[PDB]
Design an enzyme around this catalytic site. Sequence first.
Site, PDB file in Angstrom:
ATOM      1  N   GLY A  48       3.528   5.594  10.147  1.00  0.00           N
ATOM      2  CA  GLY A  48       4.896   5.258   9.829  1.00  0.00           C
ATOM      3  C   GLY A  48       5.358   3.939  10.399  1.00  0.00           C
ATOM      4  O   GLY A  48       6.479   3.507  10.098  1.00  0.00           O
TER       5      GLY A  48
ATOM      6  N   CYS B  98       3.959   1.107   9.636  1.00  0.00           N
ATOM      7  CA  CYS B  98       3.833   0.110   8.579  1.00  0.00           C
ATOM      8  C   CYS B  98       5.211  -0.265   8.046  1.00  0.00           C
ATOM      9  O   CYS B  98       6.041   0.604   7.757  1.00  0.00           O
ATOM     10  CB  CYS B  98       2.954   0.630   7.436  1.00  0.00           C
ATOM     11  SG  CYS B  98       1.567   1.700   7.904  1.00  0.00           S
TER      12      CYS B  98
ATOM     13  N   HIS C 276       0.805  -1.217   0.000  1.00  0.00           N
ATOM     14  CA  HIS C 276       0.000   0.000   0.000  1.00  0.00           C
ATOM     15  C   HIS C 276       0.841   1.270   0.000  1.00  0.00           C
ATOM     16  O   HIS C 276       0.286   2.358   0.186  1.00  0.00           O
ATOM     17  CB  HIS C 276      -0.955   0.005   1.199  1.00  0.00           C
ATOM     18  CG  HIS C 276      -0.269   0.044   2.531  1.00  0.00           C
ATOM     19  ND1 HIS C 276      -0.341  -0.995   3.434  1.00  0.00           N
ATOM     20  CD2 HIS C 276       0.473   1.008   3.126  1.00  0.00           C
ATOM     21  CE1 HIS C 276       0.345  -0.681   4.519  1.00  0.00           C
ATOM     22  NE2 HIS C 276       0.848   0.530   4.358  1.00  0.00           N
TER      23      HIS C 276
HETATM   24  C1  LIG Z   1      -1.538   5.973   2.129  1.00  0.00           C
HETATM   25  N1  LIG Z   1      -0.881   5.044   3.026  1.00  0.00           N
HETATM   26  C2  LIG Z   1       0.496   4.688   2.754  1.00  0.00           C
HETATM   27  C3  LIG Z   1      -1.553   4.484   4.080  1.00  0.00           C
HETATM   28  C4  LIG Z   1      -0.886   3.668   5.005  1.00  0.00           C
HETATM   29  C5  LIG Z   1      -1.551   3.115   6.074  1.00  0.00           C
HETATM   30  C6  LIG Z   1      -2.941   3.304   6.264  1.00  0.00           C
HETATM   31  N2  LIG Z   1      -3.659   2.751   7.388  1.00  0.00           N
HETATM   32  C7  LIG Z   1      -5.063   2.495   7.075  1.00  0.00           C
HETATM   33  C8  LIG Z   1      -5.092   1.226   6.294  1.00  0.00           C
HETATM   34  C9  LIG Z   1      -4.096   0.320   6.090  1.00  0.00           C
HETATM   35  C10 LIG Z   1      -4.549  -0.816   5.284  1.00  0.00           C
HETATM   36 CL1  LIG Z   1      -3.583  -2.159   4.879  1.00  0.00          CL
HETATM   37  C11 LIG Z   1      -5.817  -0.739   4.850  1.00  0.00           C
HETATM   38  S1  LIG Z   1      -6.541   0.701   5.497  1.00  0.00           S
HETATM   39  C12 LIG Z   1      -3.256   2.527   8.675  1.00  0.00           C
HETATM   40  O1  LIG Z   1      -4.021   2.030   9.497  1.00  0.00           O
HETATM   41  C13 LIG Z   1      -1.848   2.914   9.060  1.00  0.00           C
HETATM   42  C14 LIG Z   1      -1.587   2.863  10.544  1.00  0.00           C
HETATM   43  C15 LIG Z   1      -0.940   1.755  11.067  1.00  0.00           C
HETATM   44  N3  LIG Z   1      -0.643   1.585  12.388  1.00  0.00           N
HETATM   45  C16 LIG Z   1      -1.001   2.538  13.213  1.00  0.00           C
HETATM   46  C17 LIG Z   1      -1.668   3.719  12.830  1.00  0.00           C
HETATM   47  C18 LIG Z   1      -2.037   4.718  13.757  1.00  0.00           C
HETATM   48  C19 LIG Z   1      -2.679   5.836  13.337  1.00  0.00           C
HETATM   49  C20 LIG Z   1      -2.992   6.029  11.983  1.00  0.00           C
HETATM   50  C21 LIG Z   1      -2.653   5.088  11.046  1.00  0.00           C
HETATM   51  O2  LIG Z   1      -3.001   5.375   9.760  1.00  0.00           O
HETATM   52  C22 LIG Z   1      -1.975   3.891  11.443  1.00  0.00           C
HETATM   53  C23 LIG Z   1      -3.597   4.148   5.344  1.00  0.00           C
HETATM   54  C24 LIG Z   1      -2.923   4.719   4.284  1.00  0.00           C
END
Ligand SMILES: CN(C)c1ccc(N(Cc2cc(Cl)cs2)C(=O)Cc2cncc3cccc(O)c23)cc1
EC number: 3.4.19.12
Lengths: 300, 306
Positions: free
Chosen positions: B143, B145, B41
């Site tokens: 970040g 991920c 992603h």
């Molecule tokens: C655009 N892009 C690189 C992006 C990366 C990650 C996400 N997502 C949403 C999804 C991930 C998947 Cl797979 C399907 S929906 C995440 O959930 C990332 C994430 C991970 N862990 C803690 C977090 C804490 C707060 C906010 C976060 O966004 C967090 C959305 C967009």
Amino acid sequence: SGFRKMAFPSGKVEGCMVQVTCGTTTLNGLWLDDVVYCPRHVICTSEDMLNPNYEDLLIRKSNHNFLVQAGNVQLRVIGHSMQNCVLKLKVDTANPKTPKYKFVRIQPGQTFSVLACYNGSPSGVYQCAMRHNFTIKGSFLNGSCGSVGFNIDYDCVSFCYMHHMELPTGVHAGTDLEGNFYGPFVDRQTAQAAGTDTTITVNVLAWLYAAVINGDRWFLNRFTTTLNDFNLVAMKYNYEPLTQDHVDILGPLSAQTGIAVLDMCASLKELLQNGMNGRTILGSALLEDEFTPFDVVRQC
Amino acid sequence: SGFRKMAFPSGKVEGCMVQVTCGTTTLNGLWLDDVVYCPRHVICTSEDMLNPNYEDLLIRKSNHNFLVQAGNVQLRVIGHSMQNCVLKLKVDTANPKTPKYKFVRIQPGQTFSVLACYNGSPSGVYQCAMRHNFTIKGSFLNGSCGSVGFNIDYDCVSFCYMHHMELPTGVHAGTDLEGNFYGPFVDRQTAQAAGTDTTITVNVLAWLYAAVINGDRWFLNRFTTTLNDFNLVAMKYNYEPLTQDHVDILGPLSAQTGIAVLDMCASLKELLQNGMNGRTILGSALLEDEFTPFDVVRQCSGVTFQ
Ligand SMILES: CN(C)c1ccc(N(Cc2cc(Cl)cs2)C(=O)Cc2cncc3cccc(O)c23)cc1
Ligand SMILES: CN(C)c1ccc(N(Cc2cc(Cl)cs2)C(=O)Cc2cncc3cccc(O)c23)cc1
């Protein structure tokens, strides 16, 4: 989101761990530049352990007595001197994996990561904090002496604990990296007992603020308290009296959550006065005092 | 003595951590040999994540639209391919810090260390258990991920987890380093929820086993029980039914500590039908199912790792 008892990436410390063997005693050493640091009771035996005279026992030693094995290499020790309870060992080769490092002595309640090692090779890493009785509760078995506590901020690694002994109560004691014992303890087998352990009042409040950030609010109440009233309740529950300095350090979390620090004390007062009710805070069914305010901000 | 939530030494893993930047999005990678692994992603924008078309966003990408960096060093990308939800990126330089590794997929109830990385720099390590709704009760922010979960056996690393998303209950889930998701989850932004959870019974018994070793023995009782007798109560309390192989895994513990498994299942059955009565087990007010029997063997024997 989330909140866990997360420790520091141990990689820097692993590259410094060696296995020091003196006579029939084998404990881990910490190899920094040309010096290998290890507890001085490595030269000691059980017979001498009651009231050893380390300076007398050390002048009876030569470098050909100390075996240091960093994996598959025998290290040529070229100097042996003492610094309080820490034994230092000069060697001909500086450790290639030596990080940027600093020796610090922490105050009670401060958390630090521990790399538990046996025979010089790491076995695991866990998070510990210095209890107010100057002991730690980490998992240690015989031969873990020489394992170190640390805290990696920036690239620099802040060494602050070396493990020496385990008390009859099961708690553990040690020294800073200069050999000064935390608390009244000494490196002798004589009868030593830990003082009664008080709960870290400031860390529980900081942990609570982290919960509010993650969304748990059931423990909150509309009440507030004066500082003197709260500490009177706190010592009833074997908690630590809370300084004005503790209030000031909890200000940064107070601003981000909007809850006054003394307002948060009221929630803590009610929580102690009522109980957990079966509900949990951040997955813990008790009140966690192993999270300093700095830990909460760093992770959140 | 003493018991702590202990993770594997992260040093081998830290030397594989790199940053990945495609377009506007930055996240963590895992540099093994001449290929780095990152969740697929990265190419997605928040606009694109609503209805992504993952095949088509790949071929649009070039080999220079991935800014990968190992510290200050910048790696040169050779090629890209998608393996399920994990994107593999070939680079010109093979990683000299690659440890003896292998890709494993853990079953639910398994524990493993999770090194938390942000912007390609490791930030923390903690122990997580694969819950039975197939999530992780872990700490992650934006970040995070690209952070990986792993186990160390002998001198061999076992990469078993990659972090992609955060569920709205504050829990987390991801893949098995081959892009294969853990549980009913997809890597898009459309209404995913964590399923109901069941306590890991075998990891509770081992945790209770630890309490006996480290002094705490109040909970033991004279009685013994039977699987069918115990398991019937287990389903009622949203516990895992205990299987045959669970007892054999706990066999070494029962020998080293000397109390029978079914005897100890009784101490749990009475405990889960009476509460803790204000008593704390290893100083915990609730039962812990995040310690596998091998985890407590690793802590009661001090298995070192080279
Ligand atoms: C655009 N892009 C690189 C992006 C990366 C990650 C996400 N997502 C949403 C999804 C991930 C998947 Cl797979 C399907 S929906 C995440 O959930 C990332 C994430 C991970 N862990 C803690 C977090 C804490 C707060 C906010 C976060 O966004 C967090 C959305 C967009
Ligand atoms: C002779 N010799 C090598 C020796 C080594 C260690 C010790 N001691 C006792 C003392 C150490 C000091 Cl300093 C003053 S008394 C230890 O406590 C060792 C130890 C350390 N950590 C965890 C343990 C867990 C279980 C059992 C242990 O023995 C543990 C005594 C003698």
